[PDB]
Every structure is written in structure tokens, then in C-alpha cells.
Amino acid sequence: EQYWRFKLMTEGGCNQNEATRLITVLKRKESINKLFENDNFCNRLSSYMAYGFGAAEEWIKKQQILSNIQPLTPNIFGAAITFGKSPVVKLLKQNAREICESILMDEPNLKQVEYIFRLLALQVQETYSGEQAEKLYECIRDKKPIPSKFEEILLPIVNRIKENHTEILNESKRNHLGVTIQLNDPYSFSTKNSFCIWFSNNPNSAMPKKIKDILEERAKQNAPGVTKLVYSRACLTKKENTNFVQWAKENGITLLDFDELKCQGEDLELWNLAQAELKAMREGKGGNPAAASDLVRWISGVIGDVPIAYVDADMPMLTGNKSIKSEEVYAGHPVLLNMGSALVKDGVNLPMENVAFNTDIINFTGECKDRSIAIKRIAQSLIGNYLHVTERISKSGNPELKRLGLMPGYHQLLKDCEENNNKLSLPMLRKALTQAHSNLSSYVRFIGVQRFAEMVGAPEDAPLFQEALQQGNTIVLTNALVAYLVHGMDNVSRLNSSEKENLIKKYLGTQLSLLYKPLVMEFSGPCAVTREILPLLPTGEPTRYIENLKQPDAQILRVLQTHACVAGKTNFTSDNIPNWITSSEEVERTQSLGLSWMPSEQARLSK
Numbered sequence: 001e002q003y004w005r006f007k008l009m010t011e012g013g014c015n016q017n018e019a020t021r022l023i024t025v026l027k028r029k030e031s032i033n034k035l036f037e038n039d040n041f042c043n044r045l046s047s048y049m050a051y052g053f054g055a056a057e058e059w060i061k062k063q064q065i066l067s068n069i070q071p072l073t074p075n076i077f078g079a080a081i082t083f084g085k086s087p088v089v090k091l092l093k094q095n096a097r098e099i100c101e102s103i104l105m106d107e108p109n110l111k112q113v114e115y116i117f118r119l120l121a122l123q124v125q126e127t128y129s130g131e132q133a134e135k136l137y138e139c140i141r142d143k144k145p146i147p148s149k150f151e152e153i154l155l156p157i158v159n160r161i162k163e164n165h166t167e168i169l170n171e172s173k174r175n176h177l178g179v180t181i182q183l184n185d186p187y188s189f190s191t192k193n194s195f196c197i198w199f200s201n202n203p204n205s206a207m208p209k210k211i212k213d214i215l216e217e218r219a220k221q222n223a224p225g226v227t228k229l230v231y232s233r234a235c236l237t238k239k240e241n242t243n244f245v246q247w248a249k250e251n252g253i254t255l256l257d258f259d260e261l262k263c264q265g266e267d268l269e270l271w272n273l274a275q276a277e278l279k280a281m282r283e284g285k286g287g288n289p290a291a292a293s294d295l296v297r298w299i300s301g302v303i304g305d306v307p308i309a310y311v312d313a314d315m316p317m318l319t320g321n322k323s324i325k326s327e328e329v330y331a332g333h334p335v336l337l338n339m340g341s342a343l344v345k346d347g348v349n350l351p352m353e354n355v356a357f358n359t360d361i362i363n364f365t366g367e368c369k370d371r372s373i374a375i376k377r378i379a380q381s382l383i384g385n386y387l388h389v390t391e392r393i394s395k396s397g398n399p400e401l402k403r404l405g406l407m408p409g410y411h412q413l414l415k416d417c418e419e420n421n422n423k424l425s426l427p428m429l430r431k432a433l434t435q436a437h438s439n440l441s442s443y444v445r446f447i448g449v450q451r452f453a454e455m456v457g458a459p460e461d462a463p464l465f466q467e468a469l470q471q472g473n474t475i476v477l478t479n480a481l482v483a484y485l486v487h488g489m490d491n492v493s494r495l496n497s498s499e500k501e502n503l504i505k506k507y508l509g510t511q512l513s514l515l516y517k518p519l520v521m522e523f524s525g526p527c528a529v530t531r532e533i534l535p536l537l538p539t540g541e542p543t544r545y546i547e548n549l550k551q552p553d554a555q556i557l558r559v560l561q562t563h564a565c566v567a568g569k570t571n572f573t574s575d576n577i578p579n580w581i582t583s584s585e586e587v588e589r590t591q592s593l594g595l596s597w598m599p600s601e602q603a604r605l606s607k
């Protein structure tokens with residue numbers, strides 16, 4: 001969402017408050033971003049904007065479907081893109097072309113020129129301030145010649161843009177998890193050693209047969225390499241543990257009962273947190289076995305000392321002719337996460353590159369000081385999130401956690417804890433939310449009636465729902481919600497109790513899932529790991545995919561792609577995140593999909 005406001009303020013006639021303002025109302029119809037990839041909403045939105053914000057917000061209201069817009073019938077940047085016959089527009093453009101030729105491997109293409117041109121324009125608009133900048137904006141919009149010494153203010157700017165795309169990132173820009181990403185790939189890895197984790201929520205069945213069949217194949221295919229499986233004795237019955245222990249012995253699987261591990265330092269903090277989840281899972285008090293696996297992943301005694309890849313228990317592999325024959329590979333970092341990128345079109349510019357991180361495959365090198373640094377860096381992040389639950393939720397950039405902070409049920413929960421001198425733990429939060437969503441009244445009481453009003457499509461009935469809530473008029477809540485579900489309340493007068501009740505159970509389950517997911521993933525999972533990696537990213541200008549850079553290792557995304565991820569370093573094949581530089585439409589794998597640790601699928605994993 002970073003890039004939205006820029007466009008609005010640079011092409012859509014917004015300013016600060018209406019630029020934000022728009023988005024706060026532009027999303028009430030997620031995914032603003034289709035609109036922005038064409039500039040046709042922004043052209044129209046600027047025409048309306050010219051007659052005030054109300055004129056624009058009224059047009060988005062009465063509009064049938066957005067992105068369905070077709071033309072009708074001191075903004076130095078933006079003025080620079082409107083009408084480049086102006087002498088200075090022409091001079092930056094030529095420089096862009098020169099820049100491209102000294103930075104690329106082939107004949108620069110339109111979008112590649114547009115990218116470097118807008119880079120010049122925004123830089124020149126940042127180098128100018130005051131009246132002379134007002135002058136320049138007037139000069140470009142009255143198309144007269146380049147002022148004296150404009151080509152000397154422009155040289156340091158051009159040399160910076162050029163240097164940024166030709167000089168290899170220095171080691172300060174390649175610090176990943178406290179370890180420099182080195183371009184000579186000194187760290188060695190195994191394509192055969194692997195471990196996975198499985199904590200069963202069913203004491204009579206240690207692991208599903210389908211997953212068991214997968215590890216049998218993994219252990220068979222990975223020749224004499226280790227195929228380790230981490231589990232918990234305390235989650236099984238004696239009978240089932242003995243069954244499990246023999247199945248692994250019979251299939252060349254190295255079992256590791258993490259309950260017997262004696263740990264020090266962060267290892268012990270992760271171990272205790274993990275046992276706490278499992279104990280809460282066992283006691284039906286909000287624990288999650290995937291959260292357990294997220295933390296156990298990073299325990300040094302669990303990983304082991306020889307190079308080894310973590311993989312999700314159900315991960316498949318390219319065994320066959322087109323696998324990797326060599327047992328050893330190399331990369332530039334001790335801990336390799338799974339990575340990829342999605343390309344977002346940006347009209348006449350180059351598409352933005354959005355990197356994705358995942359922990360479904362983590363390739364570890366052998367024991368060494370560096371791998372220990374990067375591991376400790378992750379374990380500390382995850383342990384911190386568990387120690388400061390409310391603080392992380394409060395600061396979270398996740399949409400569902402922001403809304404959780406505004407919920408009155410959440411505030412009540414906190415009040416209980418602080419008044420009861422208890423700290424809000426993750427399992428407690430998860431448990432509370434689950435109970436809250438077990439019925440519509442508790443649900444509506446937890447989220448504000450305001451919240452319930454906007455979601456159900458009638459913000460003005462918020463006071464009404466409050467009264468129906470206060471006096472047990474739970475009929476209006478049912479119909480208000482069902483009415484928003486099945487379009488209109490004429491149709492809800494054709495449902496009886498049974499069919500209406502089943503509709504509200506589905507809805508409530510879906511709402512609970514939206515919060516649950518991030519209450520595992522943002523604390524111990526891949527989103528929590530992602531948050532620890534983001535500082536390594538620029539934060540200034542977006543990352544565009546440059547295709548023929550003479551020195552590709554000047555862009556941080558190309559350094560990760562080549563030197564610090566598992567791509568091309570394992571036989572395991574994951575589709576949980578896109579491959580590198582995957583097209584936006586190609587990421588439509590998402591259309592053809594509840595995971596095994598979400599409350600529904602975990603409900604059934606035992607029952």
C-alpha cells in the first residue's frame with residue numbers, strides 16, 4: 001500500500017489528507033491496486049478532484065464498477081510527465097536514454113527509459129525547493145528553455161542514478177540476519193539432508209497416512225542422507241508412540257522427540273514457548289501445533305550440525321531425471337529462506353517487484369559462527385513477539401490485527417488481564433476469539449456494533465443493533481447479517497431457522513479465520529520472519545524489475561535471488577509462494593486452492 005498515495009498525489013490531484021482519505025473510502029466496495037496499473041482511474045479522478053474532494057468521493061459512490069473507466073467523449077514531477085515537448089522534459093529524457101545505455105546490456109526499451117526518466121524527475125523535484133522550484137514548474141509548463149546551470153545541478157543527480165544501477169551493493173546493504181550476503185557463495189549445503197516437524201493434535205494418530213507416505217518417499221529418494229522427523233512424545237499415547245517409533249525405524253526416518261532436548265539460551269526460550277503451545281493445544285486452551293513447529297524450526301539442537309533443509313512435512317520433491325544429482329551445493333548466506341517475487345504493472349513504467357518470503361523450506365548450512373548469528377537473530381525476533389503480544393498487535397501492519405485493536409471485546413479482554421494481573425498470551429487471545437465467534441451475539445458484542453454495522457451494510461443501524469443487543473433482540477442481528485449475506489431481506493424471509501443458522505456459522509467461522517491466521521503467522525511464522533528481513537529493503541523508491549542490468553548485483557532483489565534463497569539449491573518444490581519474478585496474473589495459482597492448523601481443519605484432525 002505504500003505506493004498508492006504517491007500516484008494519487010502525483011497523478012490524481014490529491015494532497016496528503018484526501019490522498020489518504022481516498023484510500024480510507026476507496027476500499028469499501030482489498031485490492032485497490034488494479035486501478036493504479038493503467039492510470040485511467042487517476043486521470044478521471046483528477047478531473048473530478050478539480051471540483052473538490054466531495055465531487056470525487058461522490059463519483060466513486062455512484063460508480064457501477066471501478067477499473068471499468070475509459071476516457072471521456074508545486075508538481076514538477078507530473079508536470080514533467082505531462083507533455084514532454086518542453087525543452088527540459090526533453091533533456092531529462094535524453095539523459096535517461098544515456099543512463100540506460102551505460103547501465104544496461106542491450107538497447108533500452110520504452111518502459112526502461114520511462115523508469116529512469118521518472119527517477120530523474122522525482123530527484124530534480126526533491127533537489128528543488130522554494131520559488132526557483134515554483135519557477136521550474138512554471139518553466140516546464142510554459143515550455144521554454146533549460147535555465148542556466150540546470151545541466152550542472154543535473155550532473156550529480158545523473159551520476160547518482162547511474163552509480164546506483166552499476167556499482168555492486170556494498171556489504172552494508174547486504175546485511176541479512178546479521179550476516180553479509182557474499183557473492184562468492186562460500187556456504188555449502190546438502191540437497192539430501194532434510195528435517196520436518198509434526199506435532200499431532202490427535203493422541204491416537206501420530207501423523208496422517210498421506211504425510212507418512214510422503215516421508216517414506218523422501219527417505220527413500222534422499223539416498224543415505226538424513227530424513228529427520230521432529231515430533232513430541234507428550235502428544236501421543238504410549239501405544240501410538242511405540243507404533244510411530246517403529247514406523248520410522250522401518251522406513252529409514254530419523255525420529256527426534258523434541259521433548260527430550262536439553263537446551264540453553266534462546267534454544268530454551270523457543271523450547272519453552274513451544275511446549276506452552278502444545279500444552280495449550282492439548283488442553284484446548286488456544287494452542288497451535290503449527291505455531292509450535294514455527295518455533296522449533298530454529299532450535300540449534302533440532303536443526304543439527306550438518307547442512308540440512310527444513311521443509312514442511314508435506315513438501316514434495318523433483319525426484320527423477322530432472323532432479324539434482326550432486327549432494328552438495330553452494331550459496332552466499334548461511335540460512336536460505338524460500339523467496340519469490342510478483343510483478344505489478346505500473347502503466348508506462350516498469351513493473352514493481354514484490355518479494356515474498358516463506359519458511360516452508362529453509363536451507364541451513366553446517367554449524368558455524370555465521371549460521372549461529374542468523375539463527376539467534378530469528379529466535380530473538382520470535383521470542384520477542386511472544387513476550388509483547390499486545391505491543392505487537394498494536395504496532396502491527398496487518399489489516400486484521402489493526403481492526404482487532406479497535407474492537408471493544410479486545411479492550412475488555414485486556415482490562416481483564418491487567419485487572420487480573422495476567423499477561424495476555426497468544427493462546428489466551430486465540431481462545432478468547434474462538435469463544436467470541438461461537439455465536440452471533442458474543443460475536444457482535446466483541447467487535448463493535450459499529451463494526452458490525454459497517455460490515456453488515458447498515459452503518460446507520462448501529463444504534464439499533466446496540467438496542468437489540470442490550471435487550472436480547474437477537475432476531476435483528478441474525479436478519480441484519482443474513483440480509484447482507486443473501487442480498488436483501490426479501491430473500492432472508494425464505495430461509496427458516498436451520499438454513500439461516502448454518503449460514504451464520506459459516507460466516508462467523510470465516511471471520512475467525514481471518515484473525516486466527518495472523519495470530520500464528522505474524523508471531524511465529526513467515527510473516528514474523530518477513531518483518532525481521534524487511535529493513536534490508538530500500539524503503540524509498542519501489543523495486544522495479546530491471547531485466548538486462550550489466551551489473552545485476554546492484555539491486556538487492558537480484559542479490560537475494562542469486563545468493564540467499566533456496567531456489568536452485570534443493571529438490572523440494574513449493575507452490576506456497578510464487579517463483580521469482582512471477583507475473584501478476586501468473587500468481588493466479590491462488591484462485592485454485594483452510595490449512596491443517598486452522599481451527600476448522602484442526603477440529604477434524606482428531607474428531
Ligand SMILES: O=c1ccn([C@@H]2O[C@H](COP(=O)(O)OP(=O)(O)O[C@H]3O[C@H](CO)[C@@H](O)[C@H](O)[C@H]3O)[C@@H](O)[C@H]2O)c(=O)[nH]1
Pocket residue numbers: 196197198199200201289290291293294311312313314359360520521524525526576595596597605
Ligand atoms: O497438526 C499439525 C499441523 C501443522 N503442523 C506444522 O505446521 C506446518 C505447516 O502445515 P501446513 O498445513 O502446510 O500449513 P501452511 O499454511 O502451509 O503453513 C504455513 O504457516 C505455518 C504457520 O505460520 C508455518 O509454520 C508453515 O511453515 C507455513 O508454511 C507443518 O509442516 C508442521 O510442521 C503440525 O506440526 N501439526
